């Protein structure tokens, strides 16, 4: 709307909204993807466990 | 396309590797860039280029 | 040598940095142009560039 004033008629079918309308949305993301477990840099690492 | 970046992936020959990681590079980084090891995420910046 | 040891570098510990790459996911939400109600009255004064309701 350009806010044009009619010469004889009145544009009563146009109005400015004041507040938004809340609606129900559909589903979204399901879950997270794969993640890493354990440390690869530590695999096969030699560990000293000999007693005194 | 402009802005949109088709997500890619880098599947290795084997199922998994010991401490496997990818140092993703992007030739002509202005056109697009990638990050991560498995996923790429080739987000484009320029509107034309290879 | 030492009488007591420990496992830090090679052990089943906790804590880690989760890193990975995931393809972009887009959620589609539809906002109806109607059901917004009406405010004010017949002009009067009306805001320019206002969506007709």
Asked if B28 is an interface residue toward chain C (Cβ–Cβ < 8 A), one would say no
Calculate the CA B34 to chain-centre distance: 4
- How far apart (Å, rounded) are the C-alpha atoms in residues C40 and C53? 11
Q: Is A41 in contact with B20 (Cβ distance < 8 A)? A: no
User: In Å, how far is C11's CA from the nearest CA of chain B?
Assistant: 16
- Report the neighbours of B using a cutoff of 3 or more CB pairs below 8 angstroms: A, C
Show residues of chain B in contact with A39, CB under 8 Å: 19
Method: cryo-EM
**C-beta contacts of C42-48 below 8 A and 24+ residues apart:** C42/A10, C42/A11, C42/A12, C43/A3, C43/A5, C43/A10, C43/A11, C45/A3, C46/A1, C46/A3, C46/A14, C46/A15, C46/A16, C47/A3, C47/A16, C48/A1, C48/A2, C48/A3
Task: Determine whether A33 is exposed, middle or buried from the number of CB atoms within 10 Å of its CB (0-12, 13-18, 19+).
Answer: exposed
Residue A41 Rama label (left phi>0; alpha psi -120 to 50; beta):
alpha
């Amino acid at each position: 709307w350009y806010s044009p004033g009619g010469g004889y008629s009145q544009r009563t079918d146009n109005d400015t909204h004041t507040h938004t309308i809340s609606g129900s949305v559909s589903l979204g993301r399901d879950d997270i993807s794969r993640q890493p477990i354990n440390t690869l840099p530590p695999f096969r690492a030699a560990h000293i466990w000999r007693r005194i | 396309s402009r802005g949109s970046q088709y997500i890619l992936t880098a599947t290795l020959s084997p199922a998994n590797a010991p401490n496997q990681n990818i140092t993703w590079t992007s030739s002509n980084p202005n056109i697009a860039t990638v990050s991560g090891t498995s996923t790429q995420g080739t987000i484009n910046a320029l509107l034309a280029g290879f | 040598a030492g009488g007591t040891g420990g496992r830090v570098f090679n052990t089943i510990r906790t804590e880690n940095v989760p890193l990975m790459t995931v393809n972009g996911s887009s959620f589609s939400l539809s906002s109806n142009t109607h059901s917004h109600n009406m405010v004010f009255g017949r002009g009067d004064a009306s805001g320019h560039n206002s969506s007709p309701n």
